[PDB]
């Protein structure tokens, strides 16, 4: 499974690193970390996404300008944003992925376990 | 970029209940696929994907089809207990950011 | 942009398709079909699908390249495409019309499968393109898996459906260069 | 001019010439993949007007011309830097650094392309700055 | 003439004959007999009759690589000049003496026959010669045709019978050339 | 004198040599058909010195050898220019463009046959003052 | 040692070990095994020997390149290996283990025998040394005998055991220089 | 420092380097025994630092990079100067003609070997001179 | 056939375009078209000789410096002389060939069809 | 260059005459040849070619031979009718203009 | 057979070329003559040995220094010895060898014929 | 170089003797080797050569064995007319310049 760890209040103007655990399977160096969020309400966005062998961004082009990159250990991956606003506030969720597709022009296609959402507020 | 059916969807308990999605340009391959729903509280399930394939055991009911861009999903003997939000995903990470649609709700 | 202050860069593009007449050319169109102009008139298409098309597993090439070459140059240049993958098995009919060849692309999981030998023709053959189904890690040439199981190569009767990429004439010279 | 290739020869362009010291360079220097482009206009030119047939493209006979005006290491390193995710040419374009009042136009390199898309002058600042340093020397 | 006041043109021929013991040579003499010098002594004969000199199709090479090689450099040559003809048939013997090889040109009219690559290989070891009975156009590289219905290769005795052309070392090195 | 070929070389001529330049320059600079020829004169000189033997002309070795000294491309071009009724060069003759005073010999130049005979100093006549230009640049 | 009052010879030597995760290389350790490295951990197997090791004249080859690989890259080696030969008999097995080759020299005198052909293709690709049991004369390529009757080519566990010579990568790259 | 070899490249020695004038040379002229080791050297650094996998070696990789990178004829020239028993170049080791004040280091001449031993400066008097000739050419 | 046309009366130190058209059989591109002269009374000589695809001259020594080239259309070949003087009398031919052979080496083997001649004065 | 028989040539009707043709040059294939005949105010008719074969239907009678430089020919059965003037053609073009015989006349 | 001649007694500072003649078989051009000497009472050493197609050396490092190299004719082969002293007192042999590997690198293995031995004093 | 069994050695007649040779570098081949005797005022004759092989005819009851560096000799039914200085040679050219043993008596 994937567990959630970091949610909770923030003020804006500010920064949070969210976590996700690995449970059961430990992480590999491929791309099987991938993030998104939805504001209550609301439907969802991708926010950026995690390879393991490399620090690699995959961001949104909106998610870039406050998503930073992440901590990739066997167990435990970490999600550093920065410069959050209100306007952030979401449910996030860790999603194992089988998503991309490796040569240089990388596709999304299939997403596969869904860790319990985690409340963020801004 | 992905468009959706309308919002307001809604159906009677048994036979089914119409749900499309289009993208702005074709899949790079045609075999690529998902959809999924949100019960309201719940994290996602994976319901199709790729060749209109199921996931994880969910009920047969489910079906979908398309190509390029434009793909369906309808499912069988509808339940009350089925309404969730509604959602595809799936795309070219050149092309797009949005690789999952806006949801419809299904009543 | 002048560099040194006289220096300008003009940018040239070339007509490669104004070699059509002597040297086959190599486009890619969509993601399922790609092909070689054999000419001013005559092509060859690549198609990259699911179907069984060919299930000649004895491929009737007896007198092949001897009795009745429907298009010599033609014949020649799917032989060469044959010739370059390393190392295993095709269907193939050739008798009348029908000027084809199916490779399937089986395997039971490592690099260096029979799928990896003939992407890597299919690929350089039809270079400057054929990203699409890239399967395959950066480095790594030969673990270059696709997602479909059937490489179709048949004789088409038109030179002009270019798009998307350029008849360029390196796919067929870089297969070659043994 | 040197080898002046017409509209019908470069694509959505006029017809180009040069001075004679760009042809002179190209059949001194080695591994200039321009010059194996050259050689096939020139081989595409002449072998139909010699031939006036419908038996146009013998692979016999263009593949004996590749073997002798092609270089196969151009080809493969090329091919190469592709799967290894460095930027590599393709043939469609070239660069040519050109003295804009004396016309002289040094040999053209080509136009490497990085994840599908054109590199800008930027990232060939340094090939560029030394070709003009290289043209100028010439000139001087 | 000089040029620019001081340059003088020399110009000087080679005595190609004296490479005889290092490397095979071709010269031609008139229009029916050509052939190779294979040393100091011993020879090689091309000839182009009409004559069906050899009628064993079925070819006894059953160890001609192997068991016994009357001239082992000789056996080279000759699988040489085989091996560079593009794509089909040839008589033969080689069981004993008759260390010979007959070639037929026959076809039932387009170029790239067999009988014009049996001809672009010929003349090209035959080359600076060889334009006897050269029935091509001019640039039709494979559209070759020949007078004569069969091309015989046989050992000789001699390495002397050198008049009408040069025993020129390009011949062998260009078939090779591959 | 750099290469110098006697009598028994060169054919119905006295022994020739040169300076030492064109040595040089034979074996830096490429597509040189007499280069290719004198790789395989040494290369006989010495064969036989060592060999010593009836076992003469090895098909092996001297395969070996062409790999290893001639330029596959300068056949093949020269026997397409033939069938394409261009003139080309049989090896039979060199031009030596050479300096009467100094002895200052060029890099020898194959000479052009044009349908079945030679061509004139006419034909060649850029050919060679070019090269008497590019010999005058040498010297000073 | 300055020429020209400051000019020096530095002398460096390659760390040749350095390249053994990307491209086989040669050492020779005593006169009767030599050996390839064919990596960081596995290697391979050249000894001279006068036992009959493998006594399989008909050598199980179906599939060899196909259903197991026991080690692709390995096979790739042997198999150039042989290809390199100039003309012709072997023994071997490669069934599960005994991942090897046999090659007999055997001869009823001259040069240009069986022989020959196989110790020209093993010193090239054991060049840097291989002196060993060089029984030819100077400039006597196709003349080269040796004091055993058998080759034994096969697969081991090791990576490490050099010294006499140096793992040079020249040996391999030579054997494919075609 | 041009292409810099570490500790662990070069055998019982430390880190070295060269100005870029020799990578520039290395590049341009033709027939270098060292320039072929060096790009085996970068290929091997780049193979194993993309791949990061068990999975290496592959020969099909390897082979095509040696068709792009490697002179099959400096290969094949030395292995028959082998068999004549003339002194040929193992690439164990190379001369490095090199300027003590400036660092300027000549491109690497490759150091043959006599009867499995090296030949001494003695037996390379004429190639070291000529050398140092071209190094203070060169410089001026 | 081949028929004739353009003969007839001329003046010295002039000119004559002789003429020779096809008849059934057009004209291809190859060297098909060849002539010939004989003064009455004497044997035959020939002239020149005709390749459609691009204008050969084919003039015998002598006949090159008064004989100029000719238009080759489908079916109908002109001959141009000029310089012409009373020597030049006698009977011309149109013949058809398959006499030359095409490689550097051109060789004369092999006449066919011929047309009437036709008499020219000069 | 090409000689010939000397042109005062006759026979009686029945039986043969002797005609001949000889070359400067050994012809450049020995299969290569021309003999035909012209009768006074007619246009010339082929006769025999390449390998001594008859052209478009003419009376078996007429034979030759040759190779080389020197050729024949005969007709059997001669009769008052094939009085003509005998010619030979063929030649290489470098080697000569004349590529025709001066011709000799049989009565 | 090997016969010896050219012994006998010299005196020191000198010189002395010993000789072998072939009986029955001829000398070929191989290294099938080779040289050995003891004195009275000793063991046998190597002089140094002879080859026939080239004048070769093959000197022990102590010989090299005076004994020079040798004649071979096809039955007659000479040792040239110079600067000879009395310690040079020994019995000479004339051996027929098959000793020589022709690699570059040389081999010792086989000696067959012997010729009887001369006695040289110094 | 190579070193040898003590001089000083005898025998009875009938049985052996034991008789050995060591270099100090391995031969260039184990199958190298040359034993052989010299009788007093005799030239020497060879016994033994490359893997045990007797030479000439000599006695079957010459044996011996070895690799690597170290040989030996043996000789059944040994006779008195055996007597002779016993020796080994063989080498390689570039390690010594002794490529015979100093010899050992044997009695
Ligand atoms: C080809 O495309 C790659 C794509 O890499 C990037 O990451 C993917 C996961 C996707 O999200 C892509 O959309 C995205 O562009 C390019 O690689 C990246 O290049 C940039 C520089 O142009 C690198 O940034 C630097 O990283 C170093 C790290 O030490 C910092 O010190 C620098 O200050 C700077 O931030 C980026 O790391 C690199 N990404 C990866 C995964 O390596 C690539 O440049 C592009 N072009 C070519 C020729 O390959
Ligand atoms: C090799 O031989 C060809 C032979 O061509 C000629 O025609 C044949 C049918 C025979 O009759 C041959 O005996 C005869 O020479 C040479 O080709 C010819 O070259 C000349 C120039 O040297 C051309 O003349 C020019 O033509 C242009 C036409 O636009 C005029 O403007 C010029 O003023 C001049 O008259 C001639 O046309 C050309 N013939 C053909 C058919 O192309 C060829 O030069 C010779 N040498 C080489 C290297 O090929
Ligand atoms: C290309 O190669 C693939 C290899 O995957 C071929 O697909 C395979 O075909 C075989 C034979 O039909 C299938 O075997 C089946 O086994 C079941 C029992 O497990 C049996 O009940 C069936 O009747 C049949 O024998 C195999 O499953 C199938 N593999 C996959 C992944 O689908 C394919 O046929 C080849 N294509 C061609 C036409 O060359
Ligand atoms: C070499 O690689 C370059 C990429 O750097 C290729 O250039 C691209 O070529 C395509 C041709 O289809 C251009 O597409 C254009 O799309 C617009 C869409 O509105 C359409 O209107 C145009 O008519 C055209 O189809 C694309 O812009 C261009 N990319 C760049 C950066 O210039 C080039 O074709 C490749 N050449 C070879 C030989 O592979
Ligand atoms: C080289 O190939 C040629 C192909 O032309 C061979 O010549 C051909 O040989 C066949 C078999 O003898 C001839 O067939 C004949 O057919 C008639 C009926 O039409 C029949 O009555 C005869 O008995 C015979 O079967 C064919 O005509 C002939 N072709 C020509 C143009 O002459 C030739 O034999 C081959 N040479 C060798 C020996 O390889
Ligand atoms: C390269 O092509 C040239 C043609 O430009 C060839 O030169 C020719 O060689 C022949 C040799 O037989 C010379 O023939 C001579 O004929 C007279 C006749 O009286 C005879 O007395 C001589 O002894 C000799 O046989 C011919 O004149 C000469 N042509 C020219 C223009 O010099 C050359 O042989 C060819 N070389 C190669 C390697 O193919
Ligand atoms: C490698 O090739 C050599 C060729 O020399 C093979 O050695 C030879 O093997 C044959 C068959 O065993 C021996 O034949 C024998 O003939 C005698 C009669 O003369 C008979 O009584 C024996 O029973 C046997 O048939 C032959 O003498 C022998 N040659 C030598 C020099 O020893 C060898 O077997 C091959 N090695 C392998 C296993 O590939
Ligand atoms: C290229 O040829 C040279 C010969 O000129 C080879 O150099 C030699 O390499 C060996 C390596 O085993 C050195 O041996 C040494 O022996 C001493 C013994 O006391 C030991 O202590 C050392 O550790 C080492 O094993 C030998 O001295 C050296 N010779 C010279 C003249 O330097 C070189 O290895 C060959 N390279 C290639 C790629 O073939
Ligand atoms: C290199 O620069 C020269 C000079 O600016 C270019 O020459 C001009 O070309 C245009 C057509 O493209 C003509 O209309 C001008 O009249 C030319 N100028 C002169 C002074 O002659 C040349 O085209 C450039 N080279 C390339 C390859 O683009
Ligand atoms: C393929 O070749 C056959 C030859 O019989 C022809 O009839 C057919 O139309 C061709 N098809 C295409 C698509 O070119
Ligand atoms: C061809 O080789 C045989 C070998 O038996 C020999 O007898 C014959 O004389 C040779 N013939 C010629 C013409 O060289
Ligand atoms: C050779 O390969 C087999 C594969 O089954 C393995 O069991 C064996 O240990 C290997 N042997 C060596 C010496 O590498």
Redesign the pocket.
Do not use: V
């Given at each position: 499974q994937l567990e959630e760890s970091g949610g909770g209040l923030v003020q804006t103007e500010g920064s949070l690193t969210l976590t996700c655990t690995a449970s059961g399977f430990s992480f590999s160096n491929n791309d099987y970390i991938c993030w998104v969020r939805q504001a209550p309400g609301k439907g969802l966005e991708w926010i950026g996404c995690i390879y393991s062998d490399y620090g690699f961004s995959f961001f949104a082009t909106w998610a870039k300008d406050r998503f930073s990159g992440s901590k990739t250990s066997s167990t435990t991956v970490t999600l550093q944003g920065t410069g959050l606003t209100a306007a952030d506030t979401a449910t996030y969720f860790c999603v194992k992925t089988y998503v991309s597709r490796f040569g240089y022009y990388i596709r999304w296609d299939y997403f596969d376990l869904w860790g319990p959402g985690t409340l963020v507020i801004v | 970029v992905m468009t959706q059916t309308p919002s307001p969807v809604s159906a009677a308990v048994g036979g089914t209940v119409s749900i499309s999605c289009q993208s702005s340009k074709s899949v790079h391959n045609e075999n690529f696929l998902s959809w999924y729903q949100q019960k309201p509280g719940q994290r996602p399930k994976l319901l199709i994907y790729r060749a209109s394939t199921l996931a994880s055991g969910v009920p047969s009911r489910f079906k979908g089809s398309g190509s390029g861009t434009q793909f369906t999903l309808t499912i069988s003997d509808v339940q009350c207990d089925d309404a969730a939000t509604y959602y595809c995903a799936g795309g070219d990470i050149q092309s797009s950011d949005d690789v999952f649609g806006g949801g419809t709700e299904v009543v | 942009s002048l560099y040194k202050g006289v220096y300008e860069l003009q940018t040239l593009e070339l007509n490669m398709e104004t070699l059509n007449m002597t040297m086959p050319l190599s486009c890619t169109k969509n993601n399922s079909h790609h092909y070689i102009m054999v000419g001013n008139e005559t092509g060859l298409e690549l198609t990259l699908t699911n179907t069984?098309i060919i299930?000649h597993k004895f491929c009737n090439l007896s007198d092949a390249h001897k009795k009745n070459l429907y298009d010599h140059a033609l014949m020649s240049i799917i032989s060469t495409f044959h010739l370059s993958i390393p190392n295993e098995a095709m269907?193939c009919d050739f008798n009348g019309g029908k000027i084809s060849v199916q490779y399937?692309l089986?395997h039971s999981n490592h690099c260096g499968t029979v799928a990896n030998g003939v992407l890597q023709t299919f690929m350089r053959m039809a270079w400057g393109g054929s990203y699409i189904a890239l399967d395959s890690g950066c480095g790594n040439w030969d673990c270059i898996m696709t997602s479909y199981?059937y490489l179709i190569i048949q004789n088409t009767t038109w030179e002009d459906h270019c798009q998307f990429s350029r008849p360029s004439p390196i796919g067929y010279l870089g297969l070659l260069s043994q």
């Open positions: - | - | 069984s299930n269907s399937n089986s199981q």
